[PDB]
Amino acid sequence: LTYLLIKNEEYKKYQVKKYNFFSSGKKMNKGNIHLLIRQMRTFKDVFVSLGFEEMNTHNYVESSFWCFDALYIPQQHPSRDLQDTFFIKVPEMCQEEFTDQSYIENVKRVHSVGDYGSFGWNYQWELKSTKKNVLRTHTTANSCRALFQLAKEYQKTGSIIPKKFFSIDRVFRNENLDSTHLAEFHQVEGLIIDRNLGLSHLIGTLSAFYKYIGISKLRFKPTFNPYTEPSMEVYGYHEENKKWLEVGNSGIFRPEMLRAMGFPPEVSVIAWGLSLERPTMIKYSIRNIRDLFGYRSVI
Amino acid sequence: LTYLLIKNEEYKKYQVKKYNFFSSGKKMNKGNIHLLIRQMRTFKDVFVSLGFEEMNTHNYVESSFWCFDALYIPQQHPSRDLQDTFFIKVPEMCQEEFTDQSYIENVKRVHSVGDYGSFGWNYQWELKSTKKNVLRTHTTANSCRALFQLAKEYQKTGSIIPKKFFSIDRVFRNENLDSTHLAEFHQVEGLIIDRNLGLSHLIGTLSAFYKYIGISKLRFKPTFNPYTEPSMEVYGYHEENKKWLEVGNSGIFRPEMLRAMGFPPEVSVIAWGLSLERPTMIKYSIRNIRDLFGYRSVI
Amino acid sequence: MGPTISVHEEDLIEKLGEKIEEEKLNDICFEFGIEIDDVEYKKKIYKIEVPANRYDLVCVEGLCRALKSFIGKYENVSYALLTKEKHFMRVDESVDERRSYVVSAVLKNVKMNENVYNNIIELQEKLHHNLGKKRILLAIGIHDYDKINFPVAYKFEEKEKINFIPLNETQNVNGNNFINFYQDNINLKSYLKIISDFEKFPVIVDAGGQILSLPPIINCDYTKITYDTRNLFIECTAIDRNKAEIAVNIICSMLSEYCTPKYSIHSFFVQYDKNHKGNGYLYPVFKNKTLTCHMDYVRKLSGILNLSVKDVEPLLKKMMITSKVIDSSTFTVDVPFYRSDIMHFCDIVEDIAIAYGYGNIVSEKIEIAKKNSLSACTELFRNVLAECTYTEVMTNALLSKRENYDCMLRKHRSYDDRKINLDEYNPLAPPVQIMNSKTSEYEIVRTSLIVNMLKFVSANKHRELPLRFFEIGDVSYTTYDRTDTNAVNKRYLSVIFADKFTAGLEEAHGMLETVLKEFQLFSDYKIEEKSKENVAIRSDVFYKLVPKEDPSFLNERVVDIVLCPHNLKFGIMGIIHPKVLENFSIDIPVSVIEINIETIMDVLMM
Amino acid sequence: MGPTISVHEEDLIEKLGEKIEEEKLNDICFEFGIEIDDVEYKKKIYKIEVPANRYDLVCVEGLCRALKSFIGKYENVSYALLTKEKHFMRVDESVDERRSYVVSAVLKNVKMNENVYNNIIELQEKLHHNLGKKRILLAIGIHDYDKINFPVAYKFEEKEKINFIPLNETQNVNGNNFINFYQDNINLKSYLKIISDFEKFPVIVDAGGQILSLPPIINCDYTKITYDTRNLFIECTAIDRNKAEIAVNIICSMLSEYCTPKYSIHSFFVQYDKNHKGNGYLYPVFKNKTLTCHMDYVRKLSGILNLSVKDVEPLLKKMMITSKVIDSSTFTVDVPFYRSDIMHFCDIVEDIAIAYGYGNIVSEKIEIAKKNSLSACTELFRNVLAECTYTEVMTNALLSKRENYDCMLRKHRSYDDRKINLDEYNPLAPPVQIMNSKTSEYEIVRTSLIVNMLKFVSANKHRELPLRFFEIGDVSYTTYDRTDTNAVNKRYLSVIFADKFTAGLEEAHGMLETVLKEFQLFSDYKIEEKSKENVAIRSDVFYKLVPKEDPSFLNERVVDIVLCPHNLKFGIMGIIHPKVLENFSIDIPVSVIEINIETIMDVLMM
Ligand SMILES: COC[C@@H]1[C@H](c2ccc(C#Cc3ccccc3)cc2)[C@@H]2CN(C(=O)Nc3ccc(OC4CC4)cc3)C[C@@H](O)[C@@H](O)CN12
Ligand SMILES: COC[C@@H]1[C@H](c2ccc(C#Cc3ccccc3)cc2)[C@@H]2CN(C(=O)Nc3ccc(OC4CC4)cc3)C[C@@H](O)[C@@H](O)CN12
Ligand SMILES: [Mg+2]
Ligand SMILES: [Mg+2]
């Protein structure tokens, strides 16, 4: 059947039954990084490879100032409505005198009466709404925090140092319980800050990024984002399967967003974002979302 | 003692002996990446982070042309002597018409009668010795292969594209069996190729590299290498311990090496190299080499 | 995201000019920013989606001319804001701040139809739902002009004085039975109870006391919209003055073209009472804003490379913008009131980019650093074995001919052997031999990993069992006339198991299966088994276990692992022979797997 | 690497000029390229190491003036190559190609000493050993001038005609007993049998038939080197003409300074016979090569930034080079025959860099991208758990107050609680509460991972046991007046074990120990145990297991994990209470570990 501690110098006089190798062996138990975390690593590898620095996104609660108002999204936008957003109840409002009053002033000014060459939005901005805590709808929020801190530090330093930032983290949407979409999901964001950038640079780093995951051909559709003009939906051709897919969204951040921060018109930021879940369930051929993540996600 | 499948709705009427938590638990068995491979990963992470591309070093046999003659090391150098080098016996010689006869011609010309502004070595070069296979003494060999291929391709293209290369791989020395040093060890090499480089750039990327492993202060000693003029021994200050250490070697490759390849004097290459073993046994406080690697290397 | 327009398919008119069909309409919308969502009959309606911010694309008419200009012609549109004396409206102290503003408009001498009537109400619902955000910020009402005795007013009146015959009914409805009346209207219960729960109710009413409308969609039945309505009066009541402005400008703008003095709407004035504001507003406004850009910004942002202002004037025309040149380094655009979405020079740049075509901006071409794949593959192998609690090992690349062959009870292949395939696993290939080892035990480079871990196991047989090691590294052998050095390296993985009571012919087998399964490469047995359970396994390539004998392995217990359909031997796995356990001083049974991870690499999935 | 010079310590002379002592000599050598290897008496010899390629630094005299110039003075050296008529040497048809060349030199009127004599022979051995590569390419011989009747010759003579009294003996030695005679000389057996095994033996011999030397170190005893040797003749016989040239130039160069007409050696001519070559050579050669550099190369290569040729002339002087300016964009250096190591403009650049000081080139300052540490730490935790065969899990961040508290048999802390420490593990901290979940079960953000994996275990209790999961992710809770949002996130890790017959109070404990051990953070029990075995464990910080009770854990079987000396609770571990296994529909025992990996992060070692 099988050798033993005793059967050396005495194994010759016995029967070695056939072993049916047309079979499987003993089942082995082994540990597993979650599929979603493997996807997250691969993306993070791509990002560190292109020289990018991870941003801090260690938070789920966000004030609407960072999530909406500092991105130059108006307060009467469907993204700021209860139906589509988890608003926070008990820690309902953030601290007064969050960030800097000068920045808050710039944001109110541009939102209401225009500034920086922009016409504005021609409503009257309310500080009261800006302080309502939500579960962040995107990590674009933390990117805006980071953009503001590097504005505030380069105003003191006087120097505009080019930089590259990425984040991968969970965000929340008040979708239904009938699995139309997901209540939670992870978002991948990257951006670059320097002097005089534009869609040529976006398409460069975009095709870089995306070939790095096996999509050599890209196409670009104009679409709308309130924080990014111009903006383009990104499609890419999946080699191993038949068709083109929607793989990302991106654009150039608006002047009202950045210049409110302190940046001069020289400075521009290019940014893009995409899901983690969709790559995952495509690569591993996962049918529906609830077989990956959540309490009923075995194997 | 411990709960059971039967003791839910019937656990209340029993004795729960004390558990001595002032103890260790069940010993767990777990798998291990080799310490040397962990060190190798960390270095490789540092390298991919600075944008570097791994070279091919998939070989242990090297012709002396690539190991010695193309690096502009003379044939009557102590590195090419039996005492310090494993020469190959059965596959003793490589193929005639290895690489290109023009390159071989350039190397003989510079070694013997000088060229490219160099005086040369004023001996008479022998094609016979250049074809003797060895176990490679360094991976500088494969770096020279790669430098030659990018020369040969940029001559056709006409364009000098800046690039960065690293390798981590085993090399061999005919040291003794009395553990003076090691017969085998892994070498880490990096280099950069572009226009008009020099020691300022070397010290830049060097302090980059080395802070990335927790050595913020560097010092530099002139020393000698036959393939690198100028060249500097690199010392770095180890924070967590008392003293400065020798941590690397480096310099700028000689014109006789590169220009023989095809490069114009515009092109220069900066390069550095270091051990894998020494970081490993410092980080993990390994006493002597034979407790890490080799047949008697448990734990 | 985005609002889905339901337009027709008979839809395609002259307006289109070409009646170009689906396939080039598709690259036209892609190049423009629209996705054609669906087509579905009731025959063959086209539901499309448009930007949420270009409210001048929420009706078929606003699309028609936009997409028309996108290629066809600018067709510099004509307006005519006549008139203030015969037709006005006033806003009462009553109006307050719960719903402050009203904006009115008079489209005189209007063409009438019954599916142009469908057109109108589709437009009204669209602006109600998105811009007006389900009527929460504005409500629009369409009244026949002629049935409303001017002037008109907008107040918050006591509900007991409110009585009118809504569009729904023939029977009057008092204010104080109003909510209760529509409380269960499927279409309107929504709006009703929330929007309005004031002490007084908001009404727009003519000088004849005739209630004409409210916040809740009901309006009087008397000013109904029906064909043979010669001309129209529109009111829009709202909490935001500006968005109501934009609302009515869109409405009268977009059906001016289909009233018989085409592209002409008559105008109204709204004068608030002393207490509220106190001011007034002359609708329609219709101001252009005429921002002027600088020539460096537009190409640096748009990444348009080399092009100048003589190339710009045609580009905006395709987006329905009017354009003229000031200077090589200056522009002069006027925003159409159309484009409420333009707040900055960058919105013009966006439109110029779209007019240019997102497929025609030349890329930065950012040079990336490729990554060696062999390293990649072996690191995945390392991880998958560490996760089964195997410990990695690293041995000497040099050994003695005595260790590799004699103790292994075998002899190496000939140096003139021509059956040797460089893609296969070649443990007894002819070795690389050293001339001058200064250490006697260093005769050759290893050609198999198994010997060194046999040494290792012997080293640690005292330790705690089972022993579960693996090594993964380079082998070398002689290849005359096939490499430039006549030698080659290969990358092997060996997995050794040892235990007092068993050689794991079951666990090594399972380990090989598990390791390869990680890369979606399966046994043939596995593929048969799971397809009898009617499951689709990766079948196009696989591996099999071929029983053979081997000097170094206990008989009937060693196997070649063979890649199919290539038919290439790439590993071995079995029990180690007791004699060679003696030779290597090993007093416990031992099982082994070795594979050449370079054979299978290209079929592995990672 | 490198050759170790053994110089004295009384050594320090005037030559030095300052007699500066060890500490600044050290930064001088570091700045120069030398490492001071050791000091050891016989009193206090200084053994140093010098570049292998600057053969003009292999004797004390060559160092002295080099390091002297390095700071002190250039001291532009003087030569004087007199004379060809009275003192020559000829090379025979015999000489062949096994050892072809000889180079001779005559240092006339020389100072003599007995430790200058030590100096000489130390020099001779050094050049023999490294440049000459253990005499395999050149052999040097020092003969008193006067005892050699000129002219002299170099031949391959029949061994039966070779007879002379070597330095060793007083008794003659024939050629055909030569090897056998020295075959067991400790110092020389090496050289002998290998170098020379020709039919004839190579001798240098004067016109009086007197054998003076050979390849094997023995020379005639008659021309010994001993004090009161007025002046010296040197021969150097070698297979490479050039390296012999460089050899003797070094020798007579470096002791010219200590013959009384200082810095002057007399010269010789060597005329090969018709058959061999046929040519001749006038030693010493002593040519300067005078390469001239261009001003862009030197700063682009040396990275010297802004500096011009007026700054260059002083810099080379410190290296003992002579320097003059041609032009703002041109140089004129002459190589001293000294510097045999200079083949290219870059060797001058190297020396200019050294003269500049490697500590004084301003760095590129290449801006690197820092990396988040929390990600780093959690990925290490992931790997160390995967390697024990635990499977990673990812749950919902939102749940119900009913799941977190009631089913867990507990209530959360107060919103006015001021004992709450943000660095600790705070499972019942006051939660973050949602206003409008559109899904009833989403009342709060989770504050502990344990509940969701209790749900998970319930989900998979049908699956194969044991279950070994872990999750590692963010928790949130309310922190009024302590963050800018009044909420905070923490990063927790929870490890759940479940099995039919046991709650693993032993395996969870071992898992915690193993996981923390990976980061060299140990139990206090561990530290006691392994220090009783007299082992040094990381002791400066550690953790302990504090028994407490918990509503949700079976009594006497749950523990606080506490970081010391900080005294901060950072996890919990124990058996789950049967009642809450009922509440969560779990019919098998379950054990748990949860820790806040942000408390221990800064003491973890990675
Ligand atoms: C609201 O839901 C949006 C979600 C999610 C998404 C979309 C956009 C962003 C963004 C952004 C952004 C834009 C500008 C600046 C900053 C951030 C983030 C997430 C995915 C984004 N999408 C997405 O990930 N799809 C995708 C992405 C990559 C990919 O890789 C190839 C397989 C190898 C494959 C698929 C696109 C679609 O899946 C889309 O259906 C759904 N999108
Ligand atoms: C022949 O043996 C040389 C070996 C090995 C080495 C040295 C130089 C090179 C090189 C090179 C080179 C130079 C120029 C161009 C290309 C390659 C390669 C290996 C280590 C190189 N050395 C070495 O690794 N030491 C070292 C390096 C890094 C390090 O990191 C800090 C702990 C965190 C710590 C120690 C230096 C010394 O250990 C030295 O004693 C031994 N050197
Ligand atoms: Mg737009
Ligand atoms: Mg030098």
XYZ file of N, CA, C and O in Angstrom, chain B residues 196-269:
296
model
N 24.283 62.010 -21.224
C 25.030 62.951 -20.388
C 24.735 62.755 -18.898
O 24.255 63.658 -18.212
N 25.051 61.570 -18.394
C 24.882 61.302 -16.970
C 26.232 61.285 -16.273
O 27.301 61.272 -16.898
N 26.159 61.269 -14.953
C 27.358 61.420 -14.155
C 27.031 61.256 -12.691
O 25.882 61.011 -12.308
N 28.067 61.433 -11.866
C 27.986 61.004 -10.471
C 26.871 61.710 -9.709
O 26.337 61.149 -8.745
N 26.490 62.920 -10.125
C 25.336 63.560 -9.497
C 24.093 62.679 -9.599
O 23.372 62.480 -8.604
N 23.848 62.105 -10.785
C 22.677 61.249 -10.968
C 22.817 59.949 -10.188
O 21.827 59.435 -9.625
N 24.036 59.390 -10.174
C 24.285 58.185 -9.398
C 23.933 58.411 -7.935
O 23.224 57.598 -7.335
N 24.375 59.535 -7.360
C 24.124 59.792 -5.939
C 22.642 60.073 -5.679
O 22.090 59.657 -4.644
N 21.970 60.759 -6.610
C 20.520 60.842 -6.549
C 19.826 59.494 -6.398
O 19.282 59.174 -5.323
N 19.865 58.689 -7.470
C 19.183 57.395 -7.424
C 19.709 56.518 -6.288
O 18.972 55.682 -5.743
N 20.962 56.712 -5.888
C 21.509 55.902 -4.813
C 20.830 56.231 -3.495
O 20.355 55.331 -2.797
N 20.753 57.520 -3.141
C 20.094 57.881 -1.889
C 18.609 57.563 -1.948
O 18.016 57.185 -0.926
N 18.008 57.644 -3.146
C 16.623 57.207 -3.325
C 16.436 55.763 -2.881
O 15.769 55.457 -1.871
N 17.009 54.884 -3.699
C 17.177 53.471 -3.433
C 17.394 53.177 -1.951
O 16.674 52.364 -1.360
N 18.371 53.833 -1.329
C 18.798 53.367 -0.017
C 17.908 53.889 1.112
O 17.650 53.158 2.079
N 17.413 55.123 1.023
C 16.402 55.522 1.986
C 15.210 54.572 1.915
O 14.665 54.181 2.955
N 14.838 54.132 0.697
C 13.758 53.156 0.504
C 13.929 51.865 1.293
O 13.038 51.010 1.278
N 15.097 51.670 1.900
C 15.315 50.573 2.832
C 15.852 51.095 4.172
O 16.391 50.341 4.977
N 15.696 52.390 4.425
C 15.954 52.892 5.763
C 17.409 53.205 6.034
O 18.002 52.780 7.038
N 17.995 53.940 5.103
C 19.344 54.453 5.238
C 19.288 55.839 4.628
O 19.342 55.995 3.401
N 19.131 56.846 5.474
C 18.891 58.188 4.975
C 20.173 58.949 4.697
O 20.144 59.908 3.917
N 21.291 58.539 5.295
C 22.573 59.217 5.128
C 23.529 58.322 4.347
O 23.642 57.119 4.633
N 24.212 58.905 3.358
C 25.177 58.169 2.547
C 26.527 58.871 2.532
O 26.611 60.096 2.635
N 27.581 58.074 2.401
C 28.929 58.575 2.165
C 29.561 57.747 1.045
O 29.130 56.625 0.761
N 30.573 58.317 0.385
C 31.095 57.737 -0.851
C 32.616 57.784 -0.887
O 33.224 58.850 -0.751
N 33.224 56.626 -1.079
C 34.668 56.494 -1.152
C 35.086 56.212 -2.582
O 34.504 55.321 -3.206
N 36.058 56.920 -3.151
C 36.609 56.461 -4.430
C 37.160 55.053 -4.251
O 37.821 54.752 -3.252
N 36.848 54.169 -5.195
C 37.562 52.898 -5.265
C 37.709 52.507 -6.739
O 37.362 53.275 -7.643
N 38.266 51.324 -6.994
C 38.584 50.907 -8.354
C 37.676 49.781 -8.817
O 37.483 48.793 -8.099
N 37.152 49.919 -10.035
C 36.532 48.830 -10.770
C 37.019 48.944 -12.204
O 37.192 50.063 -12.718
N 37.295 47.813 -12.853
C 37.763 47.875 -14.245
C 36.675 48.241 -15.251
O 37.013 48.690 -16.359
N 35.392 48.100 -14.913
C 34.343 48.476 -15.851
C 33.736 49.843 -15.577
O 32.907 50.299 -16.371
N 34.141 50.526 -14.510
C 33.448 51.734 -14.068
C 34.465 52.790 -13.669
O 35.118 52.662 -12.630
N 34.587 53.841 -14.477
C 35.327 55.042 -14.085
C 34.467 56.278 -14.334
O 33.998 56.489 -15.473
N 34.207 57.120 -13.319
C 34.557 56.945 -11.901
C 33.794 55.801 -11.224
O 32.815 55.273 -11.775
N 34.264 55.419 -10.039
C 33.594 54.406 -9.241
C 33.729 54.783 -7.767
O 34.689 55.452 -7.366
N 32.733 54.387 -6.970
C 32.702 54.741 -5.554
C 32.112 53.590 -4.751
O 31.047 53.064 -5.101
N 32.837 53.179 -3.709
C 32.245 52.401 -2.634
C 31.203 53.252 -1.916
O 31.402 54.453 -1.709
N 30.077 52.633 -1.557
C 28.959 53.330 -0.933
C 28.815 52.852 0.501
O 28.667 51.649 0.761
N 28.850 53.795 1.429
C 28.550 53.516 2.814
C 27.232 54.197 3.168
O 26.870 55.229 2.591
N 26.504 53.577 4.086
C 25.249 54.127 4.566
C 25.124 53.939 6.062
O 25.663 52.989 6.634
N 24.417 54.870 6.702
C 24.264 54.818 8.152
C 22.997 54.057 8.523
O 21.885 54.493 8.191
N 23.175 52.938 9.239
C 22.066 52.109 9.714
C 21.473 52.713 10.977
O 22.154 52.783 12.005
N 20.210 53.148 10.917
C 19.659 53.875 12.061
C 19.542 52.959 13.272
O 20.126 53.237 14.335
N 18.857 51.819 13.104
C 18.486 50.987 14.242
C 19.696 50.418 14.995
O 19.540 49.949 16.129
N 20.891 50.462 14.410
C 22.107 50.017 15.084
C 23.114 51.169 15.154
O 22.819 52.319 14.810
N 24.332 50.846 15.577
C 25.242 51.897 16.012
C 25.918 52.609 14.844
O 26.072 53.836 14.883
N 26.319 51.878 13.805
C 27.412 52.318 12.943
C 26.985 52.442 11.479
O 25.859 52.110 11.086
N 27.933 52.968 10.694
C 27.900 52.962 9.238
C 28.374 51.622 8.691
O 29.256 50.964 9.257
N 27.800 51.242 7.554
C 28.132 50.000 6.883
C 28.511 50.278 5.442
O 28.101 51.284 4.852
N 29.323 49.382 4.894
C 29.450 49.272 3.451
C 28.194 48.587 2.917
O 27.873 47.463 3.326
N 27.463 49.270 2.039
C 26.187 48.750 1.567
C 26.144 48.523 0.060
O 25.266 47.780 -0.403
N 27.037 49.114 -0.731
C 27.015 48.871 -2.159
C 28.319 49.231 -2.844
O 29.258 49.730 -2.217
N 28.372 48.957 -4.154
C 29.449 49.437 -5.020
C 28.814 49.985 -6.296
O 27.720 49.564 -6.679
N 29.489 50.928 -6.961
C 28.865 51.546 -8.131
C 29.856 52.406 -8.907
O 30.963 52.702 -8.442
N 29.397 52.864 -10.073
C 30.097 53.897 -10.822
C 29.439 54.175 -12.168
O 28.256 53.868 -12.383
N 30.230 54.776 -13.064
C 29.839 55.019 -14.454
C 30.656 54.103 -15.366
O 31.886 54.026 -15.244
N 29.972 53.408 -16.276
C 30.661 52.460 -17.130
C 31.659 53.186 -18.025
O 31.489 54.361 -18.363
N 32.723 52.479 -18.383
C 33.802 53.080 -19.139
C 33.378 53.326 -20.587
O 32.473 52.665 -21.103
N 34.013 54.289 -21.264
C 33.734 54.475 -22.701
C 34.137 53.278 -23.536
O 33.437 52.917 -24.490
N 35.262 52.650 -23.198
C 35.701 51.479 -23.943
C 34.643 50.386 -23.933
O 34.535 49.609 -24.890
N 33.850 50.308 -22.871
C 32.827 49.276 -22.831
C 31.670 49.622 -23.759
O 31.274 48.806 -24.606
N 31.138 50.844 -23.623
C 29.888 51.240 -24.266
C 30.102 51.575 -25.724
O 29.384 51.084 -26.604
N 31.066 52.450 -25.982
C 31.338 52.886 -27.338
C 31.731 51.715 -28.246
O 31.463 51.742 -29.458
N 32.326 50.663 -27.680
C 32.565 49.468 -28.477
C 31.231 48.904 -28.940
O 31.147 48.295 -30.010
N 30.202 49.095 -28.120
C 28.867 48.602 -28.426
C 28.252 49.342 -29.606
O 27.623 48.730 -30.470
N 28.433 50.658 -29.645
C 27.885 51.442 -30.727
C 27.423 52.795 -30.246
O 27.148 53.695 -31.053
N 27.347 52.948 -28.928
C 26.852 54.185 -28.351
C 27.746 55.360 -28.748
O 28.957 55.197 -28.939
N 27.171 56.550 -28.905
C 27.981 57.755 -29.075
C 28.421 58.268 -27.718
O 27.888 57.825 -26.688
N 29.369 59.210 -27.667
C 29.810 59.719 -26.356
C 28.703 60.430 -25.585
O 28.831 60.605 -24.364
N 27.632 60.859 -26.259
C 26.480 61.404 -25.549
C 25.977 60.407 -24.514
O 25.776 60.754 -23.345
N 25.813 59.147 -24.927
C 25.208 58.138 -24.071
C 26.107 57.862 -22.879
O 27.333 57.726 -23.007
N 25.498 57.776 -21.706
C 26.198 57.200 -20.577
C 25.237 56.358 -19.758
O 23.999 56.478 -19.854
N 25.853 55.467 -18.982
C 25.159 54.500 -18.158
C 25.722 54.612 -16.753
O 26.947 54.646 -16.561
